[PDB]
Design an enzyme around this catalytic site. Structure first.
Site, PDB file in Angstrom:
ATOM      1  N   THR A 196      -1.660   0.838  12.078  1.00 26.05           N
ATOM      2  CA  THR A 196      -2.847   0.065  12.401  1.00 26.05           C
ATOM      3  C   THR A 196      -2.502  -1.379  12.772  1.00 26.05           C
ATOM      4  OG1 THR A 196      -5.154  -0.069  11.729  1.00 26.05           O
ATOM      5  CG2 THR A 196      -3.529  -0.774  10.112  1.00 26.05           C
ATOM      6  N   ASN A 198       1.819  11.956   1.610  1.00 24.89           N
ATOM      7  CA  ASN A 198       2.409  11.443   0.388  1.00 24.89           C
ATOM      8  C   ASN A 198       2.759  12.563  -0.560  1.00 24.89           C
ATOM      9  OD1 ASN A 198       2.205   8.864   1.363  1.00 24.89           O
ATOM     10  ND2 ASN A 198       0.385   8.317   0.204  1.00 24.89           N
ATOM     11  N   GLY A 245       3.013  -6.264   5.703  1.00 24.52           N
ATOM     12  CA  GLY A 245       3.525  -7.582   5.369  1.00 24.52           C
ATOM     13  C   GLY A 245       4.002  -7.678   3.933  1.00 24.52           C
ATOM     14  N   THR A 246       3.338  -6.965   3.021  1.00 21.82           N
ATOM     15  CA  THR A 246       3.803  -6.941   1.639  1.00 21.82           C
ATOM     16  C   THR A 246       5.065  -6.085   1.499  1.00 21.82           C
ATOM     17  OG1 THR A 246       1.557  -7.335   0.875  1.00 21.82           O
ATOM     18  CG2 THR A 246       3.137  -6.408  -0.728  1.00 21.82           C
ATOM     19  N   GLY A 247       4.993  -4.812   1.919  1.00 20.56           N
ATOM     20  CA  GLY A 247       6.150  -3.934   1.868  1.00 20.56           C
ATOM     21  C   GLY A 247       7.406  -4.502   2.505  1.00 20.56           C
ATOM     22  N   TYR A 256      -2.882  10.125   4.746  1.00 25.36           N
ATOM     23  CA  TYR A 256      -1.910   9.592   3.805  1.00 25.36           C
ATOM     24  C   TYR A 256      -1.742  10.507   2.591  1.00 25.36           C
ATOM     25  CZ  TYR A 256      -1.598   5.241   6.410  1.00 25.36           C
ATOM     26  OH  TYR A 256      -1.343   4.301   7.400  1.00 25.36           O
ATOM     27  N   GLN A 304       0.813  -1.214   0.000  1.00 23.30           N
ATOM     28  CA  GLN A 304       0.000   0.000   0.000  1.00 23.30           C
ATOM     29  C   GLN A 304       0.852   1.272   0.000  1.00 23.30           C
ATOM     30  OE1 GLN A 304      -2.727   2.066   3.361  1.00 23.30           O
ATOM     31  NE2 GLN A 304      -3.536   0.168   2.466  1.00 23.30           N
ATOM     32  N   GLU A 348      26.362   6.930  -8.980  1.00 21.27           N
ATOM     33  CA  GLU A 348      26.901   8.119  -8.334  1.00 21.27           C
ATOM     34  C   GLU A 348      26.245   8.378  -6.981  1.00 21.27           C
ATOM     35  OE1 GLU A 348      27.234  11.513 -11.043  1.00 21.27           O
ATOM     36  OE2 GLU A 348      27.950  12.798  -9.401  1.00 21.27           O
TER      37      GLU A 348
HETATM   38  N1  LIG Z   1       3.644   7.681   4.440  1.00 22.72           N
HETATM   39  C1  LIG Z   1       2.790   6.697   4.152  1.00 22.72           C
HETATM   40  N2  LIG Z   1       2.789   5.545   4.911  1.00 22.72           N
HETATM   41  C2  LIG Z   1       1.932   4.549   4.602  1.00 22.72           C
HETATM   42  C3  LIG Z   1       1.047   4.663   3.534  1.00 22.72           C
HETATM   43  N3  LIG Z   1       0.326   3.520   3.510  1.00 22.72           N
HETATM   44  C4  LIG Z   1       0.741   2.691   4.498  1.00 22.72           C
HETATM   45  N4  LIG Z   1       1.728   3.327   5.191  1.00 22.72           N
HETATM   46  C5  LIG Z   1       2.488   2.834   6.333  1.00 22.72           C
HETATM   47  O1  LIG Z   1       2.922   1.538   5.995  1.00 22.72           O
HETATM   48  C6  LIG Z   1       2.812   0.685   7.128  1.00 22.72           C
HETATM   49  C7  LIG Z   1       1.703  -0.327   6.884  1.00 22.72           C
HETATM   50  O2  LIG Z   1       2.081  -1.132   5.809  1.00 22.72           O
HETATM   51  P1  LIG Z   1       1.376  -1.094   4.361  1.00 22.72           P
HETATM   52  O3  LIG Z   1       2.304  -0.470   3.338  1.00 22.72           O
HETATM   53  O4  LIG Z   1       0.007  -0.469   4.430  1.00 22.72           O
HETATM   54  O5  LIG Z   1       1.207  -2.691   4.237  1.00 22.72           O
HETATM   55  P2  LIG Z   1       1.411  -3.611   2.946  1.00 22.72           P
HETATM   56  O6  LIG Z   1       2.773  -3.442   2.304  1.00 22.72           O
HETATM   57  O7  LIG Z   1       0.215  -3.359   2.041  1.00 22.72           O
HETATM   58  O8  LIG Z   1       1.328  -5.144   3.537  1.00 22.72           O
HETATM   59  P3  LIG Z   1      -0.066  -5.959   3.915  1.00 22.72           P
HETATM   60  O9  LIG Z   1      -1.316  -5.136   3.659  1.00 22.72           O
HETATM   61  O10 LIG Z   1       0.032  -6.348   5.360  1.00 22.72           O
HETATM   62  O11 LIG Z   1      -0.208  -7.117   2.960  1.00 22.72           O
HETATM   63  C8  LIG Z   1       2.338   1.547   8.272  1.00 22.72           C
HETATM   64  O12 LIG Z   1       3.474   2.005   8.957  1.00 22.72           O
HETATM   65  C9  LIG Z   1       1.619   2.672   7.569  1.00 22.72           C
HETATM   66  O13 LIG Z   1       1.510   3.834   8.361  1.00 22.72           O
HETATM   67  C10 LIG Z   1       1.042   5.832   2.763  1.00 22.72           C
HETATM   68  O14 LIG Z   1       0.268   5.993   1.798  1.00 22.72           O
HETATM   69  N5  LIG Z   1       1.918   6.836   3.101  1.00 22.72           N
HETATM   70  C1  LIG Z   2      -4.607  -4.198  18.734  1.00 24.56           C
HETATM   71  O1  LIG Z   2      -4.265  -4.148  17.285  1.00 24.56           O
HETATM   72  C2  LIG Z   2      -5.401  -3.743  16.405  1.00 24.56           C
HETATM   73  C3  LIG Z   2      -6.562  -3.240  16.978  1.00 24.56           C
HETATM   74  C4  LIG Z   2      -7.603  -2.701  16.134  1.00 24.56           C
HETATM   75  C5  LIG Z   2      -7.408  -2.737  14.719  1.00 24.56           C
HETATM   76  C6  LIG Z   2      -6.227  -3.243  14.201  1.00 24.56           C
HETATM   77  N1  LIG Z   2      -5.931  -3.173  12.709  1.00 24.56           N
HETATM   78  C7  LIG Z   2      -6.803  -3.797  11.733  1.00 24.56           C
HETATM   79  C8  LIG Z   2      -8.023  -4.360  12.070  1.00 24.56           C
HETATM   80  C9  LIG Z   2      -8.755  -4.873  11.051  1.00 24.56           C
HETATM   81  N2  LIG Z   2     -10.067  -5.571  11.227  1.00 24.56           N
HETATM   82  C10 LIG Z   2     -11.052  -5.161  12.234  1.00 24.56           C
HETATM   83  C11 LIG Z   2     -10.947  -3.884  12.766  1.00 24.56           C
HETATM   84  C12 LIG Z   2     -11.910  -3.487  13.733  1.00 24.56           C
HETATM   85  C13 LIG Z   2     -12.899  -4.368  14.136  1.00 24.56           C
HETATM   86  C14 LIG Z   2     -12.935  -5.658  13.595  1.00 24.56           C
HETATM   87  N3  LIG Z   2     -14.088  -6.443  14.014  1.00 24.56           N
HETATM   88  C15 LIG Z   2     -14.258  -7.813  13.613  1.00 24.56           C
HETATM   89  O2  LIG Z   2     -13.371  -8.462  13.064  1.00 24.56           O
HETATM   90  C16 LIG Z   2     -15.447  -8.600  14.064  1.00 24.56           C
HETATM   91  C17 LIG Z   2     -14.861  -9.922  14.624  1.00 24.56           C
HETATM   92  C18 LIG Z   2     -15.491  -9.868  13.212  1.00 24.56           C
HETATM   93  C19 LIG Z   2     -12.070  -6.082  12.590  1.00 24.56           C
HETATM   94  N4  LIG Z   2      -8.245  -4.877   9.808  1.00 24.56           N
HETATM   95  C20 LIG Z   2      -7.061  -4.262   9.474  1.00 24.56           C
HETATM   96  N5  LIG Z   2      -6.359  -3.747  10.486  1.00 24.56           N
HETATM   97  C21 LIG Z   2      -5.190  -3.656  15.052  1.00 24.56           C
HETATM   98 MG   LIG Z   3      -1.929  -4.134   2.060  1.00 26.91          MG
END
Ligand SMILES: Nc1nc2c(ncn2[C@@H]2O[C@H](COP(=O)(O)OP(=O)(O)OP(=O)(O)O)[C@@H](O)[C@H]2O)c(=O)[nH]1
Ligand SMILES: COc1cccc(Nc2cc(Nc3cccc(NC(=O)C4CC4)c3)ncn2)c1
Ligand SMILES: [Mg+2]
Ligand SMILES: Nc1nc2c(ncn2[C@@H]2O[C@H](COP(=O)(O)OP(=O)(O)O)[C@@H](O)[C@H]2O)c(=O)[nH]1
Ligand SMILES: [Ca+2]
Ligand SMILES: [Cl-]
Ligand SMILES: [Mg+2]
EC number: 3.6.5.-
Lengths: 346, 424, 54, 437
Positions: free
Chosen positions: D179, D228, D144-146, D224, D11, D254
């Site tokens: 998150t 960005n 996880g992807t990044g 974001y 992302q 360089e």
């Molecule tokens: N500055 C900036 N940070 C970002 C952005 N999107 C995600 N992040 C940061 O990237 C980290 C989260 O990872 P992502 O890049 O969203 O995750 P991903 O590479 O898509 O991996 P998965 O979704 O877990 O498969 C967090 O620290 C976010 O705050 C963005 O558009 N700008």
């Molecule tokens: C303590 O760490 C935390 C804490 C809160 C968010 C996260 N981040 C997330 C969370 C998410 N799903 C999500 C988010 C809020 C509520 C729910 N309710 C459900 O699932 C109901 C059980 C089916 C699912 N999806 C991507 N990111 C991490």
């Molecule tokens: Mg992602």
């Protein structure tokens, strides 16, 4: 409510500061490794400055200035004074000092070219050797360097002040300790109450290793000295007694004769390092309490000999001083629900 | 994308029906499955929980299970009862007699494969199934015994999908039979092994909320279930509506569960609503969502430490103010959050508020204080089991005393695991 | 403070200021690791399924 | 002319790539359908901007870009957004389910099944190159992807393009915009596995970008989108030398030569000034001296840290706008007498300076005011290691308890990869301390 953490339990002053803070009813102490604090009372070694100022929702303040060790370790200070134009080699208040490493950059090929011109010009040529226990006060070079290399540490050799001001009755040495508090705004605050750490042995200008007339340290005086306690309780004369003795024996005050030079020296050192250590625009803030060590000579000229970055106060003064630290270093940043300091500025 | 919902037994079906009513209202879907709201945000993620049937009609991806036909006839007759796919009603005739063994090993075993057939038809029609939710009680026989049998069959057939439960814990103050501690201990053993998350809904807590703060003098099961469905709506709203968080099942599971077995959650809701109006400020919301009295598991949070916390806000409010108040909660009570999981409190916001409220909050806490719940059950269990009281209802279905001893030991093990991290 | 390697063009210029002079594994090695972790995964899945069979 | 391929992963990488390519088009006068009227060599060219764009017969200018995510929702907004016609569908690669904030899932489980498709789309771009020099790789540390898929990709790219340079733009984790609680794990794992495949990495701490957006742009809760567009200003400043006529940092080689004398210490610090709110009613334009001095305020860095308590190994100043050498040299001279700038003894105390007379372009309706001169400083200071310390410390707190580890082992990772990665990081921190103290 504010939160703080303690990471040096062997600090007398900040032990008392913790007590006062808790007694305020608006400060609570967290465990040493809880990061959600406002105030870190840090450790003396390897304090983790890189982790301060990264806690959202928290203003963070710490009781050390990152980089102040340049002033507070002996070879650091010699190199700072000689290399800083603000201070200069031509610095009238710091004794001639050379940084020398053990046998095992170095200034002894620089030190000889001055020492031997002291011997030829038929000047007094006593020098003292020390590192940041293990002291040599001698009159010719091959005792000094010999000794330094028996040890394994970087050392300095400083021109021993052979003509000190001697306190009568006693004919005995002393050093002055000044406590300085620098706040986050880099106000320099000199605490009203200094102390004289006296000897109880009559200065013996003859054999310099009766190291009890020559060494003012509060510990070497209690243990091995003859008359620990004859003149003053604890070899600690305070400022009113000293002003009165100066007025009577010398017809001067403490302010004019000594303190002007002490304020000048403190302000000069701290302003010299201000751009290197100031936290004015940093994501965390620093304050620090320093102890400055001075020696007055016979002509009433004040000399700086060391700065200590973690001093211990005098027992009579702990209460008032630690309360002052709270008032201007801590409550200035974290407000709660006739000052004891002099601001140094020019 | 898709979630498959299962509800089993009396309690499971009554609370599951209230869940489908509440969220059908939020998505503008009437008791016939037709959409009738204003915003398109109501339909953007509608497929998470509803299948699109011919006519743009929306049918819950819901399977309804019981061993007796009563409550499901009641739901077919209920307010939204015609919304459900009739093929998804799967029931036996003989009931489970509040007997875990009947639900898990005898009657339940005979019905389970037909239930899995409906599950399978629902799953193979999903582009990207993320997993399952089950509503049930642990105190009866069908929800607890057959619901955990189902859970293990689903895991066998879908080992890489998320499995969540909404699990009503029994309490002697709101109690149908004396054997509930037995059925709950047997069930908790299953749940500790085969779910990703379990929302622990203590019937004592729902009662106390209805009585002490809703001033309901004699709470019915309906009163308790209104709390449950409002809570469940809260905890799923981020899955159901578009927002800056593309919320899914797995990432909550990964981020809330630091140790596989410690996945039992204390849920909460704010402001606590009846069947009043002074609007709430963001600080007020934030204090109430962390208030022990808004939690649905009768555990004191101050008696434990939070391992992880999800805080979900609903409505339009200042994100800056939300961030400030959340940080103040953590910074003024930092003792209660474990320091060895940095920044263990996360915040999500859903712009669309629930029915009747401009602002609300939903709390999901993984706290060690939940051990209290399991201690209660365990004490209740041991007081009967040391005299082998009421065991014949179970040994007559083929169970052995050894399986009771094992489930007891496993739940005490789980208690110890929580205690390990309360002092770490 | 002397300015060296000054280059000028129509878009801009660049130069250098000197204040003071000076005082990987294979493709097979990677496919092996990916598939080895896949074996740990299929083993853990087999343990799960045998446990469910008991 | 030697081509550069940009790879945007996960992302953060994708959305930041979006921002950067939008900015690039604005700076080169390229429209959203890819037509560039100023290019009079239709259908081809070897101009400086052709490092980043190819040309079709219809005069479409096409980014040398690949976007990769393990789930579709982010890149689907690229495929349907303002610059949809810009990119070609084979350049936008999506999976079905993502890595769930799990390094092991991005590297081992879900990555293994898409790595070959990605390498093949990349090869299709490389085959369009007459003299490819290498890769710019955008990604978060935290996702996880990044993290996982980026390190897998980097390993393979070393294998399939051994002689090419690879540069990273890395988003370091900040709780305020996070998150996920396992970002310290993912960060350490990906830094360990990528360290020897990266020639130079630009780390951006979302915390620094967030606080810059709050202080200087007066955005109370930065999105974001805000982060960005500011990040892409910094990125554009760093790549302008590849995309415009000049003589400093003209090829990827360089960047390493000028910024990375020691190949493990390959993390230059970026400081940018000035950042001025477009809503500011009255703005007095800042001089060469004032912006060059702002390059030494930590509040303007991409990583909050204290360069006064470390040592520099290299220092580059990239100006955009009304700047001439004498004003730069005067500004440097006076800055040196009032600031703590200590180089390592084996490096010259000096600055490589690049000036492009065109002032920074701003996105219309963005948050940034137009200014008449701006500067990005790239300094290789050991003080950036502060970030490593922070990250490592968080990692240690969780890993002492094995918290969340089962999620990683369950995807086929072994526990020992954790302590292997952490020990690589401990070595890194000691490298920094021995160079800088
Ligand atoms: N500055 C900036 N940070 C970002 C952005 N999107 C995600 N992040 C940061 O990237 C980290 C989260 O990872 P992502 O890049 O969203 O995750 P991903 O590479 O898509 O991996 P998965 O979704 O877990 O498969 C967090 O620290 C976010 O705050 C963005 O558009 N700008
Ligand atoms: C303590 O760490 C935390 C804490 C809160 C968010 C996260 N981040 C997330 C969370 C998410 N799903 C999500 C988010 C809020 C509520 C729910 N309710 C459900 O699932 C109901 C059980 C089916 C699912 N999806 C991507 N990111 C991490
Ligand atoms: Mg992602
Ligand atoms: N909160 C709530 N609890 C219920 C409801 N119905 C039954 N219970 C509780 O569930 C347990 C009885 O289980 P029940 O669902 O009726 O048994 P089952 O039909 O065999 O699964 C006891 O603890 C009851 O207190 C309900 O509608 N709401
Ligand atoms: Ca052309
Ligand atoms: Cl090659
Ligand atoms: Mg019943």
């Amino acid at each position: 409510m504010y939160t703080f953490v303690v990471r040096d339990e062997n600090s007398s002053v900040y032990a008392e500061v913790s007590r006062l803070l808790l007694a305020t009813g608006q400060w609570k102490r967290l465990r040493k490794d809880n990061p959600r604090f406002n105030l870190m009372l840090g450790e003396r070694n390897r304090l983790p400055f890189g982790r301060l100022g990264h806690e959202p929702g928290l203003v963070q303040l710490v009781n050390y200035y990152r980089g102040a060790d340049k002033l507070c370790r002996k070879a650091s200070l010699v190199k700072l004074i000689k290399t800083s134009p603000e201070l200069s080699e031509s610095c009238t208040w710091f004794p001639e000092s050379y940084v020398i490493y053990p046998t095992n950059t170095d200034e002894r090929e620089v030190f000889l070219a001055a020492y031997n011109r002291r011997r030829e010009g038929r000047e007094g040529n006593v020098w003292i050797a020390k590192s940041s226990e293990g002291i040599l006060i001698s009159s010719e070079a091959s005792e000094l360097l010999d000794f330094i290399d028996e040890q394994g540490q970087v050392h300095v050799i400083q021109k021993y002040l052979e003509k000190p001001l001697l306190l009568e009755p006693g004919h005995r040495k002393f050093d002055i300790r000044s406590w300085v508090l620098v706040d986050h705004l880099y106000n320099i605050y000199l605490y009203r109450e200094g102390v004289l750490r006296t000897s109880s042995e009559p200065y013996n200008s003859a054999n310099f290793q009766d190291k009890t007339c020559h060494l003012t340290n509060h510990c070497i005086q209690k243990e091995y000295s003859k008359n620990y306690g004859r003149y003053e309780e604890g070899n600690e004369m305070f400022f009113e007694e000293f002003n009165q003795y100066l007025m009577d024996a010398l017809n001067t005050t403490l302010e004019n004769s000594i303190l002007l030079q002490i304020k000048h020296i403190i302000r000069s050192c701290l302003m010299c390092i201000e751009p290197a250590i100031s936290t004015k625009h940093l994501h965390y803030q620093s304050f620090q309490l320093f102890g400055f060590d001075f020696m007055v000579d016979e002509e009433l000229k004040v000399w700086l000999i060391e700065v200590n970055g973690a001093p211990a106060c005098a027992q009579k003064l702990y209460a008032e001083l630690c309360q002052g630290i709270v008032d201007v270093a801590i409550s200035s940043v974290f407000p709660l629900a006739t000052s004891i300091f002099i601001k140094l500025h020019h | 994308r898709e979630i498959v919902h299962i509800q089993a037994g009396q309690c499971g079906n009554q609370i599951g029906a209230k869940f489908w009513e509440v969220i059908s209202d939020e998505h503008g879907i009437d008791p016939t499955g037709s959409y009738h709201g204003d915003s398109d945000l109501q339909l953007e993620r509608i497929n998470v929980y509803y299948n699109e049937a011919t006519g743009n009609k929306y049918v819950p991806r819901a399977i309804l299970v019981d061993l007796e036909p009563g409550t499901m006839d009641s739901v077919r007759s209920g307010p939204f009862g015609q919304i459900f796919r009739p093929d998804n009603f799967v029931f036996g005739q003989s009931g489970a007699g509040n007997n875990w063994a009947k639900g898990h090993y005898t009657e339940g075993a005979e019905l389970v494969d037909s239930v899995l057939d409906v599950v399978r038809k629902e799953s193979e029609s999903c582009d990207c199934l993320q997993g399952f939710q089950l509503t049930h009680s642990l105190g009866g026989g069908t929800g607890s015994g057959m619901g955990t049998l189902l859970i293990s069959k689903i895991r066998e057939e879908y080992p890489d999908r998320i499995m969540n439960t909404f699990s009503v814990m029994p309490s002697p103050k709101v109690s149908d039979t004396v054997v509930e501690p037995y059925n709950a201990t047997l069930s908790v053993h299953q749940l500790v092994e085969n779910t990703d998350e379990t929302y622990c809904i203590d019937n004592e807590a729902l009662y106390d909320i209805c009585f002490r703060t809703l001033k309901l003098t004699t709470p019915t099961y309906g009163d308790l279930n209104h709390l449950v469905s409002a809570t469940m709506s809260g905890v799923t709203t981020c899955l159901r509506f578009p927002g800056q968080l593309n919320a899914d099942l797995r990432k909550l599971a990964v981020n809330m569960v630091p140790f596989p077995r410690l996945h039992f959650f204390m849920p909460g809701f704010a402001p606590l609503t009846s069947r009043q109006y002074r609007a709430l400020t963001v600080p007020e919301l934030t204090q109430q969502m962390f208030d022990s009295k808004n939690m649905m598991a009768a555990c004191d949070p101050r008696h434990g430490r939070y391992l992880t916390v999800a805080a979900i806000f609903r409505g339009r409010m200042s994100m800056k103010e939300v961030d400030e108040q959340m940080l103040n909660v953590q910074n003024k009570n930092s003792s209660y959050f474990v320091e060895w999981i940095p920044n263990n409190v996360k915040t999500a916001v859903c712009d669309i508020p629930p029915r009747g409220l401009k602002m609300s909050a939903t709390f999901i806490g993984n706290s060690t204080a939940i051990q209290e719940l399991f201690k209660r059950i365990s004490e209740q269990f041991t007081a009967m089991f040391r005299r082998k009281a009421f065991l014949h209802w179970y040994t007559g279905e083929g169970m052995d005393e050894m399986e009771f001893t094992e489930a007891e030991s496993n739940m005490n093990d789980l208690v110890s695991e929580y205690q390990q991290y309360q002092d770490a | 403070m002397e300015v060296i390697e000054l280059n000028k063009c129509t878009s801009g210029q660049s130069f250098e200021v000197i204040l003071k002079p000076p005082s990987d594994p294979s493709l097979e090695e990677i496919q092996k690791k990916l598939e080895a972790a896949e074996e740990r995964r299929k083993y853990q899945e087999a343990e799960l399924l045998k446990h469910l069979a008991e | 002319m030697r081509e550069c391929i940009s790879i945007h992963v996960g992302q953060a990488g994708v959305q930041i790539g979006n921002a950067c390519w939008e900015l690039y088009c604005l700076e080169h006068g390229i429209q959203p359908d890819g037509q560039m009227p100023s290019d009079k060599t239709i259908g081809g060219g070897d101009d400086s901007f052709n490092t980043f764009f190819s040309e079709t017969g219809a005069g479409k200018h096409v980014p040398r870009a690949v976007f990769v995510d393990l789930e579709p929702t982010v890149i689907d907004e690229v495929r349907t957004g303002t610059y949809r016609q810009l990119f070609h569908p084979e350049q936008l690669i999506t999976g079905k389910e993502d890595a769930a904030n799990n390094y092991a899932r991005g590297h081992y489980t879900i990555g293994k099944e898409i790595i070959d498709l990605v390498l093949d789309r990349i090869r299709k771009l490389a085959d369009q190159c007459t003299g490819l020099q290498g890769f710019l790789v955008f990604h978060s540390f935290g996702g996880g992807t990044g993290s996982g898929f980026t390190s897998l990709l980097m390993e393979r790219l070393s294998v399939d393009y051994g002689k090419k340079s690879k540069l990273e733009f890395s988003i370091y984790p900040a709780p305020q915009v996070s998150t996920a609680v396992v970002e310290p794990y993912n960060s350490i794992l990906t830094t360990h596995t990528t360290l020897e495949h990266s020639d130079c990495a630009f780390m951006v701490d979302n915390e620094a970008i967030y606080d810059i957006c709050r202080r200087n742009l007066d955005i109370e809760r930065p999105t974001y989108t805000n982060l960005n567009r500011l990040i892409s200003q910094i990125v554009s400043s760093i790549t302008a030398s590849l995309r415009f006529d000049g003589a400093l940092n003209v090829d990827l080689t360089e960047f390493q030569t000028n910024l990375v004398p020691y190949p493990r210490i390959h993390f230059p610090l970026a400081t940018y000034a000035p950042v001025i709110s477009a809503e500011k009613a009255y703005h007095e334009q800042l001089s060469v001296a004032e912006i060059t001095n702002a390059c030494f305020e930590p509040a303007n860095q991409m990583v909050k840290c204290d360069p006064r308590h470390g040592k520099y190994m290299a220092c580059c100043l990239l100006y955009r706008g009304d700047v001439v050498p004498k004003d730069v040299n005067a500004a440097i001279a006076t800055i040196k007498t009032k600031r703590s700038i200590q180089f390592v003894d084996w490096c010259p105390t000096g600055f490589k300076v690049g000036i492009n007379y065109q002032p920074p372009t701003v996105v219309p309706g963005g948050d940034l005011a137009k200014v008449q001169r701006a500067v990005c400083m790239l300094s290789n200071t050991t003080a950036i290691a502060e970030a490593w310390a922070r990250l490592d410390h968080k990692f240690d707190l969780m890993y002492a308890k094995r918290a969340f580890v089962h999620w990683y082992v369950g995807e086929g990772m072994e526990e020992g990869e954790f302590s292997e990665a952490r020990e690589d990081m401990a070595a890194l921190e000691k490298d920094y301390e021995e160079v800088g103290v």
